[PDB]
Structure 1
């Protein structure tokens, strides 16, 4: 039992982490970086111990010796008697969403359209869609496929950032942190919802959580589920209730990574941390709730029921699975063995 230093990405995540720290008796403390990458670096140097990551980043981190410790687990149906922490992870559905009123827009007519991505290097927002788009066009010119986009993490003055609005003053345009108005799952969908983009690459859960009154946020309160449509790969369009038969791919859950020599200790603290601030935690909602950030998915996704033991002590490759790891490899060829820092 020593402290665990968590790496928060951006001002909002550090605010939430500072609250978590205060409520934990400093059992968990914070470190901040303007970027997920920078946070990986801080963990490599040994200045931060852990952070929760999307599959695309687990891959970057894995190449540098970091290892998945616990995964986020959301609501399911299979394995009912099994507890959340021991229950296998279901994965999540990556989808391409559009406005219904945008008739005639299919997967086959996305060229020169306007796209909203969660952030460069992420699973549903970048890796899967651009992976499919490169293969389909047999070209690495993925910077020239759309006319304009908001793909946080790309060059601020390039087309991939043309649609990003930055912040509130307009500063930090395109930064890969929750301060890019259109950063992440929620931001990319808002990008679509406000008709800035024609399509948004998010996950199925995002569409549901921000429509039909589920979100009390200004831009989303009047959002209706039936005004959106998913783009399947066979060229058709289906209602967002058909996600199960109209997705680009099934993605591995976001997971908490840490240096291999610190993993056991990070795991220990965290389990006890959710016993306190998790879904049924002793001090949530009374004092602090670890998985609630208010439709903002800070540190963790708001739909996390709990952090689950992986098991079978995964290396990063088998946690991400073999078909996904090859998909990233091939995409990375465009822009084999080496840590990127």
Structure 2
């Protein structure tokens, strides 16, 4: 029917600008509403202030309980049928130096840790969710002698490692150097014993792919993976040694607008999508002015979902039961309300 416009929630200033140019070129088929944080963003979605956004596994879980549903998945593979075939997602991994000692999954206690950010999927949710059953309480400041968890209390032992000066030290955002998959890996190399990151993090930051001096001489082969059974495997072996598998980023919207957003978005990708990509004098949807904006730049097409309609089926067994046993206890307000 006469599907009305779709509002996109732009988490940043740049997410906003991109969303604007989009809005224009879409001739209003899509419009934007800004937000301070990803959460309240998903809230504006909740009440009808906004019609959709895309988010990682954990947030998909949160909105999932909030009653929203994933319409489409982000696909980074090159395929002749990109949209048809669903992608298996990615792997969370605990990375260590091949030259580091005796570290094993069970003996991590007392060791120094490097995390992407608190509350985020692979750097926090998965690892802390798996260790939660071991320690079965909520204080992770107690488990590791110290580490870097961006977003943790400033006097927390988990800010002890984090770099950065003044107010932004340990900050959840790039103001803090050890923030992110990247920052987490850097932390591993310079400070921590363990790093919790995705399986692409190491190759990404080694072999000269990362210009910065600390990296770039770093040999991917010099780092390995901690397997849940006590053993280790090479970085390229993450499939057979890992904590849990997260799903691809996906777009979520309220039940009613589901069909509509689904419809319009596909048109949008055929207009602005992979090819044509001429981002020079035209608008490319997946390309970004800075980094992945409203979409991972690695995005090829937005794909349908065969058997997974529901956020639980989407996230898959491995994800949950590695999490939700974690929270349980989560200080996120929206989750609490949602319960």
- Could you tell me whether the CA contact under 8 Å between 2:92 and 2:246 is conserved in 1? yes
Q: Which sits farther off after the overlay, 100-109 or 197-206?
A: 100-109
Offset, 1:281: 3.4
CA RMSD of aligned residues (A): 3.1
Q: Which sits farther off after the overlay, 41-50 or 60-69?
A: 41-50
Where 2:122 maps in the other structure, the secondary structure is: helix
The correspondence of residues 144-155 of structure 1 with structure 2, limited to 5 A, is 144-155=142-153
Where 1:69 maps in the other structure, the secondary structure is: strand
State the match for 2:250 in structure 1: 255
Offset, 1:93: 1.2
Q: Give runs of ≥4 in structure 1 deviating > 6 Å.
A: none
Structure 2: which 5+ runs fail to align? none
State the match for 2:299 in structure 1: 304
Structure 1: which 5+ runs fail to align? none
Offset, 1:7: 1.7
C-alpha change, 1:289 and 1:208, in structure 2 (3 Å) is farther
Where 1:327 maps in the other structure, the secondary structure is: coil
State the match for 2:67 in structure 1: 65
Offset, 1:302: 3.6
Offset, 1:172: 4.4
Out of 79, 82, 85, which is 1:84 matched to?
82
Residue 314 of structure 1 pairs with residue 309 of structure 2: yes
State the match for 1:43 in structure 2: 45
State the match for 1:203 in structure 2: 198
Offset, 1:306: 2.2
How many angstroms apart in 1 are the aligned matches of 2:256 and 2:186?
40
How many angstroms apart in 2 are the aligned matches of 1:244 and 1:87?
20
- Could you tell me whether the CA contact under 8 Å between 1:10 and 1:179 is conserved in 2? no
How many angstroms apart in 2 are the aligned matches of 1:203 and 1:261?
34
Number of equivalenced pairs:
333
Larger gyration radius, structure 1 or structure 2: 2
State the match for 1:184 in structure 2: 180
C-alpha change, 1:21 and 1:67, in structure 2 (3 Å) is same
Out of 117, 122, 127, which is 2:115 matched to?
117
C-alpha change, 1:313 and 1:94, in structure 2 (3 Å) is closer
Offset, 1:173: 4.5
State the match for 1:129 in structure 2: 127
